[PDB]
């Protein structure tokens, strides 16, 4: 999670979509969902990113409805967005032990207990935090079994991106579990 602000540039696809949903939080605008194979995924937008400007206009105070309406009414050719990188999230690096554990329990993606003398404990992983990404892969909407699988198939080094549950629960409201599972980008970034 890099601290400053970056500019991204998008073209709407042939359907007129960029593959984003946006949510008003605390008078900012935040990314609620990025679609796979979308102009938004290709330019590197992520769940939890803050959108500061769209085409040079400040997003402060916009409702979700107004942010979506502005995207729809932009000429599709070139859309500039100014982005602050996942401001409500933090990344924790852990090492698996010999038994292949990092040292926590989770349920519905939310960390619920930290195991004593684990890497999780040494690095100060917290409970009541939702898992957002693992090694830069978005895992929002995946079943717990699939998140466990990704943890096994990772190297010894495991980086987890987490968000306080109360903020996470606010970002994902008005968005059905089946959209998060099917449509949220879960790919590894392309080069």
From Swiss-Prot:
<keyword id="KW-0206">Cytoskeleton</keyword>
<keyword id="KW-0539">Nucleus</keyword>
<dbReference type="GO" id="GO:0072562">
    <property type="term" value="C:blood microparticle"/>
</dbReference>
<keyword id="KW-0256">Endoplasmic reticulum</keyword>
<dbReference type="GO" id="GO:0000122">
    <property type="term" value="P:negative regulation of transcription by RNA polymerase II"/>
</dbReference>
<dbReference type="GO" id="GO:0005829">
    <property type="term" value="C:cytosol"/>
</dbReference>
<dbReference type="GO" id="GO:0005576">
    <property type="term" value="C:extracellular region"/>
</dbReference>
<dbReference type="GO" id="GO:0005737">
    <property type="term" value="C:cytoplasm"/>
</dbReference>
<dbReference type="GO" id="GO:0046330">
    <property type="term" value="P:positive regulation of JNK cascade"/>
</dbReference>
<keyword id="KW-0472">Membrane</keyword>
<dbReference type="GO" id="GO:0005137">
    <property type="term" value="F:interleukin-5 receptor binding"/>
</dbReference>
<dbReference type="GO" id="GO:0007346">
    <property type="term" value="P:regulation of mitotic cell cycle"/>
</dbReference>
<dbReference type="GO" id="GO:0007268">
    <property type="term" value="P:chemical synaptic transmission"/>
</dbReference>
<dbReference type="GO" id="GO:0030036">
    <property type="term" value="P:actin cytoskeleton organization"/>
</dbReference>
<dbReference type="GO" id="GO:0016020">
    <property type="term" value="C:membrane"/>
</dbReference>
<dbReference type="GO" id="GO:0030511">
    <property type="term" value="P:positive regulation of transforming growth factor beta receptor signaling pathway"/>
</dbReference>
<dbReference type="GO" id="GO:0045545">
    <property type="term" value="F:syndecan binding"/>
</dbReference>
<dbReference type="GO" id="GO:1903561">
    <property type="term" value="C:extracellular vesicle"/>
</dbReference>
<dbReference type="GO" id="GO:0042470">
    <property type="term" value="C:melanosome"/>
</dbReference>
<feature type="domain" description="PDZ 1">
    <location>
        <begin position="7"/>
        <end position="86"/>
    </location>
</feature>
<dbReference type="GO" id="GO:0005634">
    <property type="term" value="C:nucleus"/>
</dbReference>
<dbReference type="GO" id="GO:1903553">
    <property type="term" value="P:positive regulation of extracellular exosome assembly"/>
</dbReference>
<feature type="binding site">
    <location>
        <begin position="143"/>
        <end position="144"/>
    </location>
    <ligand>
        <name>a 1,2-diacyl-sn-glycero-3-phospho-(1D-myo-inositol-4,5-bisphosphate)</name>
    </ligand>
</feature>
<keyword id="KW-0677">Repeat</keyword>
<feature type="domain" description="PDZ 2">
    <location>
        <begin position="91"/>
        <end position="166"/>
    </location>
</feature>
<keyword id="KW-0597">Phosphoprotein</keyword>
<dbReference type="GO" id="GO:0006930">
    <property type="term" value="P:substrate-dependent cell migration, cell extension"/>
</dbReference>
<dbReference type="GO" id="GO:0031965">
    <property type="term" value="C:nuclear membrane"/>
</dbReference>
<dbReference type="GO" id="GO:0008284">
    <property type="term" value="P:positive regulation of cell population proliferation"/>
</dbReference>
<dbReference type="GO" id="GO:0030335">
    <property type="term" value="P:positive regulation of cell migration"/>
</dbReference>
<dbReference type="GO" id="GO:0042327">
    <property type="term" value="P:positive regulation of phosphorylation"/>
</dbReference>
<keyword id="KW-0007">Acetylation</keyword>
<comment type="subunit">
    <text>Monomer and homodimer. Interacts with SDC1, SDC2, SDC3, SDC4, NRXN2, EPHA7, EPHB1, NF2 isoform 1, TGFA and IL5RA. Interacts with NFASC and PTPRJ. Interacts with SDCBP2. Interacts with PDCD6IP. Forms a complex with PDCD6IP and SDC2. Interacts (via C-terminus) with TGFBR1. Binds to FZD7; this interaction is increased by inositol trisphosphate (IP3). Interacts with SMO.</text>
</comment>
<dbReference type="GO" id="GO:0007265">
    <property type="term" value="P:Ras protein signal transduction"/>
</dbReference>
<comment type="function">
    <text>Multifunctional adapter protein involved in diverse array of functions including trafficking of transmembrane proteins, neuro and immunomodulation, exosome biogenesis, and tumorigenesis. Positively regulates TGFB1-mediated SMAD2/3 activation and TGFB1-induced epithelial-to-mesenchymal transition (EMT) and cell migration in various cell types. May increase TGFB1 signaling by enhancing cell-surface expression of TGFR1 by preventing the interaction between TGFR1 and CAV1 and subsequent CAV1-dependent internalization and degradation of TGFR1.</text>
</comment>
<keyword id="KW-0964">Secreted</keyword>
<keyword id="KW-0963">Cytoplasm</keyword>
<dbReference type="GO" id="GO:0035578">
    <property type="term" value="C:azurophil granule lumen"/>
</dbReference>
<dbReference type="GO" id="GO:0005856">
    <property type="term" value="C:cytoskeleton"/>
</dbReference>
<dbReference type="GO" id="GO:0045202">
    <property type="term" value="C:synapse"/>
</dbReference>
<dbReference type="GO" id="GO:0005109">
    <property type="term" value="F:frizzled binding"/>
</dbReference>
<dbReference type="GO" id="GO:0005925">
    <property type="term" value="C:focal adhesion"/>
</dbReference>
């Amino acid at each position: 999670i890099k601290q400053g602000i970056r500019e991204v540039i998008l073209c709407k696809d042939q359907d007129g979509k960029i593959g984003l949903r946006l949510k008003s939080i605390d008078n900012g605008i935040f990314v609620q969902l990025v679609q796979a194979n979308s102009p938004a995924s290709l330019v590197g937008l992520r769940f939890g990113d803050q959108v500061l400007q769209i085409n040079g206009e400040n997003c402060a105070g916009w409702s979700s409805d107004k942010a979506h309406k502005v995207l729809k009414q932009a000429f599709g050719e070139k859309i500039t967005m100014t982005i602050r990188d996942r401001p409500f999230e933090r990344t924790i690096t852990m090492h698996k032990d010999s038994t292949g554990h990092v040292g926590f329990i989770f349920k519905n993606g939310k960390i619920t207990s930290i195991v004593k003398d684990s890497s999780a404990a040494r690095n100060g992983l917290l409970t009541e935090h939702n898992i957002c990404e693992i090694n830069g892969q978005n895992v929002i909407g995946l079943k717990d079994s699939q998140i466990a699988d990704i943890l096994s198939t990772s190297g010894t080094v495991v980086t987890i991106t987490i968000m306080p549950a109360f903020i996470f629960e606010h970002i994902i409201k008005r968005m059905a579990p089946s959209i998060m599972k099917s449509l949220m980008d879960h790919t590894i970034p392309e080069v």
